[PDB]
Amino acid sequence: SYDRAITVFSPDGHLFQVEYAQEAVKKGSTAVGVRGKDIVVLGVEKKSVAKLQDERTVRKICALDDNVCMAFAGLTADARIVINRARVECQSHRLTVEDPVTVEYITRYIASLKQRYTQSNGRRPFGISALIVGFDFDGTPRLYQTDPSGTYHAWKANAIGRGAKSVREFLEKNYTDDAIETDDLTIKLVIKALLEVVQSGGKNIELAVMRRDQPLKILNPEEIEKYVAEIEKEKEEN
Amino acid sequence: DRGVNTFSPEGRLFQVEYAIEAIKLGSTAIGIQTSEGVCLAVEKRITSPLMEPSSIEKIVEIDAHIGCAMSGLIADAKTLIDKARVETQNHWFTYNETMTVESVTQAVSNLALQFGEEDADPGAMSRPFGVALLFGGVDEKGPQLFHMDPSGTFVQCDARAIGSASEGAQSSLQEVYHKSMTLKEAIKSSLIILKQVMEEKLNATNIELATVQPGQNFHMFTKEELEEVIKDI
Amino acid sequence: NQYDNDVTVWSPQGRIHQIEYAMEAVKQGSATVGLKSKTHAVLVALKRAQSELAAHQKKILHVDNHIGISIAGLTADARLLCNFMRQECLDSRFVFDRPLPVSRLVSLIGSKTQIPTQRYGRRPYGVGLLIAGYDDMGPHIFQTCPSANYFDCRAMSIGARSQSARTYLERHMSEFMECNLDELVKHGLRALRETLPAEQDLTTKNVSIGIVGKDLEFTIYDDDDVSPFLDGLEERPQ
Amino acid sequence: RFSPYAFNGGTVLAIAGEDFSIVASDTRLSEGFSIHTRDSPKCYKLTDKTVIGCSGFHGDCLTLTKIIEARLKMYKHSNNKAMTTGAIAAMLSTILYSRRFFPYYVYNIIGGLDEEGKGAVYSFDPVGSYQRDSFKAGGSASAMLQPLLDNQVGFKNMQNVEHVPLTLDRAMRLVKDVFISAAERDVYTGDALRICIVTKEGIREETVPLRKD
Amino acid sequence: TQNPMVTGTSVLGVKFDGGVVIAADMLGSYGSLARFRNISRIMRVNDSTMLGASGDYADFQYLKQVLGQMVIDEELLGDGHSYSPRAIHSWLTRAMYSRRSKMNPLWNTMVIGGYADGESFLGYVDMLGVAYEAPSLATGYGAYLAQPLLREVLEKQPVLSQTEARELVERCMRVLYYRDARSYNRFQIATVTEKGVEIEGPLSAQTNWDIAHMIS
Amino acid sequence: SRRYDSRTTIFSPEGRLYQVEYAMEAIGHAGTCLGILANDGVLLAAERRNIHKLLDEVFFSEKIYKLNEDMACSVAGITSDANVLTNELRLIAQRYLLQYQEPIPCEQLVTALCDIKQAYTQFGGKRPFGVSLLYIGWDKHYGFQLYQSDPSGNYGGWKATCIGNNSAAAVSMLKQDYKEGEMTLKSALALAVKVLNKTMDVSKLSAEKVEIATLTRESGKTVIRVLKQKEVEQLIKKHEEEEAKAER
Amino acid sequence: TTTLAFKFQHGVIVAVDSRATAGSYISSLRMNKVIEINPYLLGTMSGCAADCQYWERLLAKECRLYYLRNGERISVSAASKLLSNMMLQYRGMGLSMGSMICGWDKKGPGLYYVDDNGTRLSGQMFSTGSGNTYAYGVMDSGYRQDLSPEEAYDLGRRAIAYATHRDNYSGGVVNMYHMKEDGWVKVESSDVSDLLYKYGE
Amino acid sequence: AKRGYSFSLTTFSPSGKLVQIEYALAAVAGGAPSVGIKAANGVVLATEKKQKSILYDERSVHKVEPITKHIGLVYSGMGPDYRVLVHRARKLAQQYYLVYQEPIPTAQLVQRVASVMQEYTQSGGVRPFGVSLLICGWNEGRPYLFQSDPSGAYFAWKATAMGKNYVNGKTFLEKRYNEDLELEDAIHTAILTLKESFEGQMTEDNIEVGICNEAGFRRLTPTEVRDYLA
Ligand SMILES: *[C@@](C)(CO)[C@](*)(O)[C@H](Cc1ccccc1)NC(=O)[C@H](Cc1ccc(OC)cc1)NC(=O)[C@H](C)NC(=O)CN1CCOCC1
Ligand SMILES: [Cl-]
Ligand SMILES: [Cl-]
Ligand SMILES: [Cl-]
Ligand SMILES: [Cl-]
Ligand SMILES: [Cl-]
Ligand SMILES: [Cl-]
Ligand SMILES: [Cl-]
Ligand SMILES: [Cl-]
Ligand SMILES: [Cl-]
Ligand SMILES: [Cl-]
Ligand SMILES: [Cl-]
Ligand SMILES: [Cl-]
Ligand SMILES: [Cl-]
Ligand SMILES: [Cl-]
Ligand SMILES: [Cl-]
Ligand SMILES: [Cl-]
Ligand SMILES: [Cl-]
Ligand SMILES: [Cl-]
Ligand SMILES: [Cl-]
Ligand SMILES: [K+]
Ligand SMILES: [K+]
Ligand SMILES: [K+]
Ligand SMILES: [K+]
Ligand SMILES: [K+]
């Protein structure tokens, strides 16, 4: 077996390998999640598909369990490993314990997995950050995010990838009850914050929404383009 | 390029000294050992008002009578904390009693320099933990506070601070400590020193406060209770 | 230097630098003194504080009813060696029901400490020990180092400024064999005192004592239990 | 084939009072219809506060006492204190259960004081099921020792006795009496009776001769 | 060992004033058959402790070599330390129980005689790990035949001179020869004292067969 | 020891993996390999790099592998690494069959090998497989499918794509010509020969230099054929005859 | 042993006997067969004593870790499922343990029966031990969802007491608990034979 | 005591080239020349066995080796490395026979042997083989000739050469080799391709040649080689 320490401390006290993995996520496609009142919605971008490529395959919104879904940014090949490890863990928590996974627990596992890859021999850290969206069994909405280091926090709204600094700053200015009042305006809030950084066009936007008790919904490029119309009718006018 | 178990000409392990440096980037945490209890306090370091307040947990519960303040690489700490929690419950199972604060700290200190490359397991450690820990609690030797760093070295403290502003808070505790301090003055002092060494103003949602006193168990402070101790500035 | 990163690399002069670098770790720790009479073996060590608010470090540790140690160097390497010594003493009592002779225990350290100096990826033990014990052959004072080498000594000092203590004992080594226990400890304290700067002297907070012999099992006196020995002090001269 | 067990007899008794604990046993070691030795007391000092009594297969009892001895030292180096009576009893339960599928043919009773200075007694089975109680007997003659203690110490089956608290003096005679009775009926009980008294002062041993047939 | 092949019968032990004396006959049986009538079942461990062994002879010879090497190893260090009779007894107890617990026992019963620090030592070791100390010892059929004799004398006279112990032992070997079908009339006496271990050559107990004429 | 370690599974300062990107360069120097998806089928077309008067032609193909009853792939890169992966692809396919008693869905088989290739970039300290793969097949869920595999362990579903030499030129050539939802297998076969002819090195094109395999659904059975030499000859010449009708 | 538990409008009540038997002999008559895991979890014991003690304490050990990790306490469903899984690791090795898990989580009042075999079922009523059939008879004859705390205390008391009268291996005392919305409260430790004389007028 | 290196000694350079494989190719390109010719009714394999001294016993070691009854081997490159591959080839041939009770198809042996070669281009602490293999065989009434090389890649040949002057030997064969030879003709054109790269005078001791047909595979005796040397 390969027993070399890959991730080690620098003289200044830096984990370069973990920091390089954070450079990989910053090169990743724009991903934004926001918690509403009744629903939670994710949105993912920098899609840039050749239109010669079938896009059903390159979808960055993944469901981990019945009540949990996630979005990622960075090395998409790494993400697939993490996602399927989390999917296996979702079914094991269901076998060891009757209860379905809490959002915080699955986030904690994914975080513990990434952390383990920063302190174990023979392996490099994962090159992805995750945004985890789900509902509690009591119904209170939950949004979390992780990074290559292994740290996780809960967010009201957040962005990762390229244009994260730009979109994040937008969310701080635009996150009030006037925007969260309805279910429609929260979806609109994602699209607006999304269309704010991407090479414009609702054709490059795949976003998912899930209501308190409803199964996960991936939206029609019809439904989202209908909302892109309510932004352009209220952009030249407003 | 060298190995992880290499000695400096000085006489220290590089990876350990570098792990000490990683803590100097972590948010500051203070513990105070009062004759009538132990108080732990830490700054959260909010990066955005979008981040959830109670989401960051830099002071956690290990046992009914033990609290742990953490600084440095948070992700490294929570692996060590689970190990601390596992040890207490293994000990409870085997001996039907609560562990001493010294033994709990000693248990975590055993994982110290258990890292390496060759002549090791597949899942053996590649590096040390970029974390410092303050174990504060009450056992049959009264109230106690212990400090631990990546060298494995652990020692009791009457009062200690660790993090980015370590020396500044250390001097502030030095001239403001009586071994006869009350718990009212203990929480106050930690709150007074915290605002001085920080880049952000002290809010009720900005910090975590914890008490372990003989009578009652480890307690996580609620926002309303924080507003009563921040009332006396 | 390129002959000094691994223990498995010999210097052209015919030396191993990584052993010598580990030997430096011993010298940086606070001083500790071991001496013996025909009946007793006494350890005297200087506790150190990083700050005045923190307590003093433990210097003297229990091994068995008839064996005790004082440490100098890395804490974890000291704790690891202490646990090996304890385990060896336990196995000896478990199997033979009689205490493990001091000579043989030290020989086991000499054999164990040698292993890591000869394997790649391993490192020497960053601690030196002073071992005080009592067996069929009377009292013993032993010395171990990062190099697997060990010595049987009439008296010894290791740590910072241990040269001063070493010279004190060297003058009075013929004195010890007919010494009363109270006179023996004062000799140990007087040597430890020489290590300190002229401004400061031995206090009840910074002095630790370990005693084993014909009369009693190994005992550690620390704070209030230490002042009987300090009181009755010939004054610090120059 | 080959049997890993032998039966060596021995009965052990423990009683708890306000500030004392009593652990008592016969001194007979036997095998088949022969006596191995007449000088084999089953009581053993672990700490100044706690005493153990083991009976059954002597090979198991010997190795188990040595495991406990080593484990006591391991605890004190690690925790910087002595293992309490309750802690030893808790540890013994786990040690015995680690052999659930190849058990120690052993009957252990723990006698000492709790942290409040009060008398404590712990009774075990070969596999580690245990609890605290005022009085318990284990071994080949335990069924002979039990009912008399149930009646006199527990005040069972009685109508207008005033329920006098247990004294050291009375318990001492009680311990002596039940063994005198058992030595008359049980062939594995005899020779001598050793009583270990645990108090705040420490462990005091006492010997009273028994039937040698 | 699951089934022992060549076995030895009872080993005798009793401690006199200033030492211990051990007896065992020079027979190795293969079932009922007397196979080897001139083999030693006793050894000198060192100058303070000695050992006689019942049961499987191959297991005894194995334990003889392991103990033999342990003494050599200790003599090499020359650190003023040596194994006491109690230390050998404790080791042997730990060895037997360990082998027994792995369901692969050393098929032996042992008597360990010794003299150290002005005190006489006599210890019993079983194949199951049963261990204790007694003033007199007898294994196998000796426990039923010789042990009653020894106890009845030691009750009347606790301290014996070396001569008294010797003649008591010879008397016991007489009983064993008469009554044990797995015994023989060739035996050895081992002795520990201030001077060390002394094993004496082939001995025969005096027999009388005059009761062969008392059946009419 | 660590003196000799090339540190293959390690991060670069920019946040990228060197060995993976260096493996990408190896693909560029290998044969041009294209896949095109049609309405009534899907095909692979690849440049033969093993060409000589003295080669024996024993196997049906050089770069086309049958993996499954309903799936075939084509390869570009180091052929030994390709053989290792294709044999493994055949194994994963059979394990799924053994377990479920129905053929493995196209995407799933690709995903499985990609997980192995990705594992080689993260742990083990080994060099990655210097191979890109083009998968074509039919399953009962998504019908006719085409997939692309990177040495990174990353995959994507395509309607038309290419890997190997002059790859970027070949795809932009396809990007103009490919008629989405209107492509028949006859149209896709003609496009393949067109893209190859412009992309290839020796210029005139030959039935010894190209390899074409078609995957069709016929009579409720998935039929896979590697096109015969007489067939490739007519495919090249039909493009040649149209190259003579392009002037006046 | 005899062990019983049932739920009604005001929570769940739990009653056990206190006899320990070795062969035909009563080893202990003051044996505690309820384990108080947390303030609102409760475990009963039946079968091999050392098996019960160890394994339900090991469940308790893990219910402790769950609370310290998740910081939110463990559900009843989770606990009983975890125990069933521990039992399943030691399959066909001769562990004899019959236990009922009681508690209050968000789902309301939770009652569960776990076997040494791995069997695990939720329900309104359960009874384990050598005297379960007797405990069942008196339980069913005099049960309704509309019991008051006093009626339920009467029933559980009655059920153990009557079971201990017919069962050779049940006796000692009745130990009863009331599982309320804000945790269990221990009702009584009443002598079995004393009740049987009271019920005999 | 020891434990091997776990990292690859063959990695990708920025150019996308596995340098150690190309460096292994240089080892074979500098070895003694070897030629194989598929000849309609059989196969021939010949090599330069010039030990460059009269002190050697020419009969002691062989370069043309039998793998089984119907398969043979020659090499250009390192002799010691080749021996490893021969031993591995013989075992694989037997492993196949034991399972299927049928002589291993030459194509299947070559694939299995080529996979072993691939391992040493990726496995830790090892260098690739510095040998290229020429494997002949007869199965299903058809002659086969294959080339395996350090890469783990394998090729099928009508005729080819390797080692010293492999480029000149190849062009010679292009012009000289025609399909539908008789086997005895192929031995001539094999020895002729060998003469192009020789340097010295050819005796039956200087060169080694094996043949494969429907009757199996055998190495020609020194007396047989002399009769073709005219
Ligand atoms: C009633 C009294 C009927 O037995 C209960 O089931 C009670 C359960 C219980 C639970 C926790 C605390 C106390 C009591 N069971 C027992 O009293 C139990 C009976 C039993 C014996 C063996 C079994 O396995 C086949 C199953 C049930 N008694 C014991 O567990 C006793 C204390 N243990 C032993 O006798 C130990 N043996 C096992 C092997 O070694 C020799 C002795
Ligand atoms: Cl599973
Ligand atoms: Cl892992
Ligand atoms: Cl980011
Ligand atoms: Cl250090
Ligand atoms: Cl620090
Ligand atoms: Cl040196
Ligand atoms: Cl240190
Ligand atoms: Cl020194
Ligand atoms: Cl009293
Ligand atoms: Cl002999
Ligand atoms: Cl025997
Ligand atoms: Cl052993
Ligand atoms: Cl004894
Ligand atoms: Cl290649
Ligand atoms: Cl690995
Ligand atoms: Cl390695
Ligand atoms: Cl060779
Ligand atoms: Cl095969
Ligand atoms: Cl041949
Ligand atoms: K090293
Ligand atoms: K068994
Ligand atoms: K019992
Ligand atoms: K005899
Ligand atoms: K237990």
B40: domain CATH number is 3.60.20.10
- Cα F36 from Cα F170, distance rounded (Å): 12
CA of A123 to the centre of ligand 3 (A): 10
Residue H14, domain extent: 1-230
Rounded CA gap, E87 and C95, in Å? 8
Q: Does domain A1-238 correspond to CATH entry 3.60.20.10?
A: yes
Which of chain D's residues have a Cβ under 8 Å away from the Cβ of G52? 129
Mutate to test the interface with D, among E90, E101, E130 (most CBs of D within 10 A): E130
Q: Is the dihedral of CA E189, E194, E197, E201 positive or negative?
A: negative
Residues 67-106 of D with CB under 8 A from B: 78-81, 83-84, 86-87, 89-91, 94
Q: Would you state the structure tokens that stand for residue C132, as one six-digit string?
A: 């005080």
Q: How far is B154 from chain D (nearest CA, A)?
A: 14
| Domains and their CATH numbers in chain F | 1-248 (3.60.20.10)
Q: What are the angstrom distances between the C-alpha of E19 and each of C98, E13, E53?
A: 22, 11, 19
Question: Inter-chain contact B103–D86, Cβ cutoff 8 Å?
Answer: no
CB H122 within 8 A of CB H135: no
Distance B117 CA to ligand 17 centre (A): 8
* Residue among B228, B147, B138 at smallest CA distance from B188: B228
Q: G32: Cβ below 6 Å to ligand 1?
A: no
- Put simply, whether G82 touches A (Cβ < 8 Å) is yes
Establish whether chain G is in contact with chain A, requiring a minimum of 3 CB pairs below 8 angstroms. Answer: yes
The C-alpha atoms of residue E25 and residue E12 are separated, in whole angstroms, by 9
Count Cβ atoms below 10 Å from residue A165 Cβ, excluding itself.
Answer: 10
Calpha distance F47→F187 (Å, rounded): 19
State the Cα–Cα distance between residues H73 and F233, nearest whole angstrom.
Answer: 37
DSSP states of chain C: --SSS-TT---TTS--HHHHHHHHHHHHSPPEEEEE-SSEEEEEEE---SSSSB-PPP-EEEEETTEEEEEEE-HHHHHHHHHHHHHHHHHHHHHHSSPPPHHHHHHHHHHHTTHHHHSTT----SEEEEEEEEETTEEEEEEE-SSS-EEEESEEEESTTHHHHHHHHHHSTTTGGG--HHHHHHHHHHHHHHHS-TT----TTTEEEEEEESS---EEE-STTTHHHHSS------
G78 and A137 within 8 Å at the Cβ level: the answer is no
Q: Which CATH number goes with the domain that contains G47? A: 3.60.20.10
Vertex F164: Cα angle to F160 and F167 (nearest 5): 55
d(CA H119, CA H62): 26
User: Ligand 1 pocket: which of G48, G54, G175 to mutate (most atoms <8 Å of CB)?
Assistant: G48
Out of E130, E134, E143, whose CB is closest to D58?
E130
Please identify which residue in the block is written with the tokens 């178990």: B5
User: Which residue has its alpha carbon closest to ligand 1 atom 23?
Assistant: G48
Partner G, chain D 112-131, Cβ-Cβ below 8 Å = 123, 125, 127-131
Residue D170 contacts residue D36 (beta carbons within 8 Å): no
CATH architecture for segment(s) C1-238: 4-Layer Sandwich (3.60)
CA distance F109 to F96: 9
Whether residue E126 and residue D6 make contact (CB cut-off 8 A), yes or no, is: yes
Domain boundaries, chain D: 1-213
Domain count, chain G: 1
Side-chain-side CA neighbours of residue F153 (13 Å) = 21
CB atoms within 10 A of CB G145: 8
- How far from the centroid of its chain's Cα atoms is residue D166's Cα? 19
- Beta carbons within 8 Å of C217's beta carbon, 6+ residues apart: C65, C66
3-state secondary structure of E68: helix
Q: How far is CA G64 from CA A108, A170, B62, D11, G58, in A?
A: 18, 43, 11, 39, 10
| Sequence-distant (≥ 6) Cβ neighbours of residue H87 within 8 angstroms | none
Residue E18 alpha carbon to ligand 11 centre in Å:
28
Task: Report the CATH number of the D1-213 domain.
Answer: 3.60.20.10
Burial class for D9, CB neighbours closer than 10 Å (0-12, 13-18, 19+): buried
Task: Annotate chain H with DSSP letters as a single string.
Answer: ------SBS--B-TTS-BHHHHHHHHHHHTSPPEEEEE-SS-EEEEEE---SSSSS-TTT--SSEESSSSEEEEEEE-HHHHHHHHHHHHHHHHHHHHHHSSPPPHHHHHHHHHHHHHHTTTSBT-PPP-EEEEEEEE-SS-EEEEEE-TTS-EEEBSEEEESTTHHHHHHHHHHH--SS--HHHHHHHHHHHHHTT--S---TTTEEEEEEETTEEEEPPHHHHHHH--
G78 in a labelled binding site? no
User: In Å, how far is B64's CA from the nearest CA of chain G?
Assistant: 9
Burial label, E71 (beta-carbon count in 10 A; 0-12, 13-18, 19+): middle
DSSP state for residue G41 in the 8-state scheme? E
Query: Cβ-count burial of G141 within 10 angstroms (0-12 exposed, 13-18 middle, 19+ buried)?
Result: exposed
Name which of H85, H73, H112 is nearest H96 in CA terms: H112
Q: How far apart are CA H213 and CA H221, in angstroms?
A: 16
Cβ under 8 Å to B: C residues 96-125: 119-124
Starting from the CA of residue D28, give the closest ligand.
Answer: 14
Task: Answer yes or no: do A21 and F11 touch at CB < 8 A.
Answer: yes
Experimental technique used? X-ray
Ligand 8 centroid, distance to B16 Cα (angstroms) = 9
Please check whether the domain covering E1-216 is classified as CATH 3.90.230.10: no
Please tell me if the CB atom of residue G31 comes closer than 6 angstroms to any atom of ligand 1: yes
Determine whether G1 is an active site residue. yes
Pairing of strands D50-56, B59-63: unpaired
Asked if F144 and F28 touch (Cβ cutoff 8 Å), the reply is no
Contact yes or no, D with F (3+ CB pairs under 8 Å): no
Question: Measured at the alpha carbon of residue G180, what is the angle toward residues G175 and G185, in degrees to the nearest 5?
Answer: 40
Q: Say yes or no for a CB contact (<8 Å) between C93 and D70.
A: yes
Q: Measured between alpha carbons, how far is residue A203 from residues A47, A225, D69 in Å?
A: 9, 8, 76
Q: Which of residues 142-201 of B touch A (CB under 8 A)?
A: none
Touching E (3+ Cβ pairs <8 A), the chains are C, D
Q: Where are the domains of chain E?
A: 1-216
**Quick check: CB of G163 below 6 Å from ligand 1?**
no
Other chains touching A, judged by 3 or more CB pairs under 8 Å: B, F, G, H
Most A CBs within 10 Å: which of G63, G66, G76, G81, as the mutation test of the A interface? Answer: G81
Resolution (Å units): 2.9
Separation of alpha carbons E111 and E138, rounded Å: 8
The residue whose CA is least distant from atom 18 of ligand 1 is G48
Q: Which ligand 1 atom lies nearest to the CA of residue D103?
A: 40
Say whether residue G108 is in contact with chain A using an 8 A CB cutoff: no
Domain that holds residue B29: 1-233
Residue F5 CA to ligand 16 center (angstroms) comes to 14
Show the tokens assigned to B11: 């006489």
Please name every residue paired with A31 in a beta bridge, in sequence order, or none if there are none.
A44, A160
| Chain F: closest CA distance from residue B121 (Å) | 14
What sign has the CA pseudo-torsion C67, C70, C73, C75? positive
| HSE-up (13 A, CA, CB side) for residue E141 | 15
CA H35 – CA H198 distance, rounded (Å): 12
For residue C123, give the nearest of A107, B119, A3 by alpha carbon.
Answer: B119
CA atoms within 13 A on the CB side of H186: 28
Facing residue for B18 by CB, picked from A6, A13, A115: A13
Chains B and E touch, contact meaning at least 3 pairs of CB atoms under 8 angstroms apart: no
